[model samples]
Target: DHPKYSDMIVAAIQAEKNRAGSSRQSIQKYIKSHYKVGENADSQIKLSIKRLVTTGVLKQTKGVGASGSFRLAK
Candidate 1:
């Protein structure tokens, strides 16, 4: 089961108001420093990002290499 992490993700993205899109690295680091959920931290973050994109709270965007990034919905 997935934890309800979108609110946390939204807050992290909102914290960085200067950027239109947020990289996965930044969000993962934020999660590590700000909250301690459990193991599989990266996996949870990735899943949370996907869920957010699906729910329309965030928009998926292109990133370097095969990785993708996200921006808050307008």
Candidate 2:
């Protein structure tokens, strides 16, 4: 069974212990390596991460929208 993109994002963030959190590029790379995603996976990941931020599941620590580092909401 494959993990949902949201779950993948959360796991990726938790996998590292950076004070500033994980960058979007790092999260995408982590997902690509840890999961079997399709060609549109990049866009899908971008959307999923955006949704996670809007939903309060994740917090953007740097930059804005889908172009920043992210961390799980406290």
Candidate 3:
């Protein structure tokens, strides 16, 4: 079967979410490191985060955990 970019995106998001508490900026950095340049990552990572949040899965807040952290919705 063909690999899906969406799936990969979700995986990245979850990795950050379960990162023992990581900041949004940290997650974004991870996303950037895994996908693209740091400054070039916001749009792509933001898109994935929006989807996860809109779907009622991932939760996030500013200046929490590592810095601007996120976690999974319970």
lDDT of 1 by residue, 1-74 (tens): 86566667667667744465556666567767766876876686676666656777655666742176655567
Of candidates 3 and 1, the better by TM-score: 1
lDDT of each: 0.64, 0.69, 0.61
TM-score rank order: 2, 1, 3
Question: Can you list the residue pairs that collide in candidate 2?
Answer: none
**Model 2 weakest lDDT span, ten residues long:** 13-22
| Stretches > 4 Å off in candidate 1 | 1-4, 64-66
Error of 2 at 67 (Å): 0.9
My TM-score estimates for the predictions, one after another, are 0.61, 0.69, 0.52
Candidates ranked by lDDT, best first?
2, 1, 3
Which model scores highest in lDDT? 2
Q: Judge candidate 1 at residue 2 and give its lDDT.
A: 60
Better of 2 and 3 by TM-score: 2
Q: Pick the candidate with the highest TM-score.
A: 2
Q: Model 3: per-residue lDDT, tens digit, 1-74?
A: 54565666667767766647556665566666655544644566567557767777767655533346666667
Stretches of model 3 off by over 4 angstroms after superposition: 1-3, 14-19, 35-41, 61-67
Q: Candidate 3 clashing pairs?
A: 24-68
Model 1: number of clashes? 0
